[PDB]
Amino acid sequence: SGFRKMAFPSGKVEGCMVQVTCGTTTLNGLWLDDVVYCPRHVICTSEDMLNPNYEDLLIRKSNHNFLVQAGNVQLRVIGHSMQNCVLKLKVDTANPKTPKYKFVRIQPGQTFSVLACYNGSPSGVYQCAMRPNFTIKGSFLNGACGSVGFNIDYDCVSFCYMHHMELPTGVHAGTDLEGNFYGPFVDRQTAQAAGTDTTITVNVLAWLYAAVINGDRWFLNRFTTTLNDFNLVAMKYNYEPLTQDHVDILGPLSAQTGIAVLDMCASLKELLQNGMNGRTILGSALLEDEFTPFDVVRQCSGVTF
Amino acid sequence: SGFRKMAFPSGKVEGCMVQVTCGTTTLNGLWLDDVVYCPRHVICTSEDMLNPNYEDLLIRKSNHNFLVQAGNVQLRVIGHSMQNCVLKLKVDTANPKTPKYKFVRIQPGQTFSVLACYNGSPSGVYQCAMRPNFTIKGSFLNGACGSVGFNIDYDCVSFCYMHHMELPTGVHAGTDLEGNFYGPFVDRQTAQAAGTDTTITVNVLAWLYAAVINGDRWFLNRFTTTLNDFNLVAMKYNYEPLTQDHVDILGPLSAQTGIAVLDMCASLKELLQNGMNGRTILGSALLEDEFTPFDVVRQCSGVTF
Structure with missing residues (x-):
């Protein structure tokens, strides 16, 4: 007996976390098979974030401008592309620790575990709900972007969330793993209204x-x-x-x-x-x-x- | 920003969890180097638990009474011994996934993550305090015994708790990894008073x-x-x-x-x-x-x- 807010065991996800650097900016990526997924705003300066033209910013970048480190192993980037708000970096090595996985877009009111990471390294795990207004109330300091949310069924990790931003109100917004934001949010440093929240x-x-x-x-x-x-x-x-x-x-x-x-x-x-x-x-x-x-x-x- | 009750990433501990069966009783064990640690009450029947003589009960057990399974691989017990309230099963293979680790006895008021496991398989992870009265307010169903609590510092897992007992009041009691109970508790199915608790x-x-x-x-x-x-x-x-x-x-x-x-x-x-x-x-x-x-x-x- 007893009842606690319980997260899924994080081990299968820990094995997929990497560090991604592009110029001055470092955040987290997710390495599955031979692709690393990360927030596209890795390519932005602080100034860029106020009003970024992501297509133009990405054109200035080449494969060798993306530094991807998996522990102490440097991955070789052999391709890059943008899907919605995520970057997909093709690397020359498949992640040997890739779990069975799915990408899922979750419904408001569903719950998931977040593995909060900094510089590609896991910090902690906690359970979150997707609010009816498509925000989450997480714990994310500077550098946490690219941390993911997931569910596990048996041996299969269903990834449902990638962290992108903190709204001025202190709540959190992010995308599915196809890079589509939950809610009306955009990856720009601007005031953004979340709707009235409601209780689930x-x-x-x-x-x-x-x-x-x-x-x-x-x-x-x-x-x-x-x-x-x-x-x-x-x-x-x-x-x-x-x-x-x-x-x-x-x-x-x-x-x-x-x-x-x-x-x-x-x-x-x-x-x-x-x-x-x-x-x-x-x-x-x-x-x-x-x-x-x-x-x-x-x-x-x-x-x- | 934001602040959440956050557990440590559990991956290093997941790789150490095994199933231990002795007759009718199955619970969890912790496989570190060539030793598997589990609650000694694995050797008890339901009836034994009312008033066990552990020394006498252990003498009647042989190595081949202890079935230890790591996923689908059967480990082979080559020795058994009792340290306070924990059983140490010597196995013929060192765990290749053994992390850097310490055994620590924590103070009341200190916190740790619990990896709740059933049949040797991780179920979930949550952060717990050791109450001033040396109980924990956990979430543990039938079969959770042998689940462990831990902290991580850098690369080193400090194990501080092994789960043994649910008291009639629904709070939880257990030992350090040298098998010494926290608090006045014993591994017998008897009414046992916990202290007045206090707030930390x-x-x-x-x-x-x-x-x-x-x-x-x-x-x-x-x-x-x-x-x-x-x-x-x-x-x-x-x-x-x-x-x-x-x-x-x-x-x-x-x-x-x-x-x-x-x-x-x-x-x-x-x-x-x-x-x-x-x-x-x-x-x-x-x-x-x-x-x-x-x-x-x-x-x-x-x-x-």
């Missing part, structure tokens, strides 16, 4: 189920509700609307606990309307939304990789 | 410094305090007394922020006495005590391994 309702419900399984049950009440009634309340509290698809995803947790999903919605409704009265759930004094239904099941059933 | 004051202060560095400063005040006065309040709120050693450890964070340590204590005193009034600090509605001063510095300065 299906995740809060999953976490309430986790709480019951662990024996934290004070918030269970004698009421039920309907989807439409619940959603009137969700909207007022800037929660995501709950759909039948969400109810369906919660089915296994409903079955384990014997608590109908709409009964748990009525418990959540009371918590929203009345607050938590200084009480805690699973060691938290706020409603936690960074655990997916699958996360809860995984942790409550001991799935391994 | 120096860690709360470190986290308040982390908050300031990250731009959360509402809780700062121009009140002052003395160590003796502060400690009168700490005692009332079941906080650990703060010593000059603790003040000294917070010195670098004091210097970075320009906030004297006793000024931060006066801020903490107000938070304890008056509560947080529905406000948050670093995304938390409670005072967080699982970040050490060194953890804060590490994360705020981007140290890598």
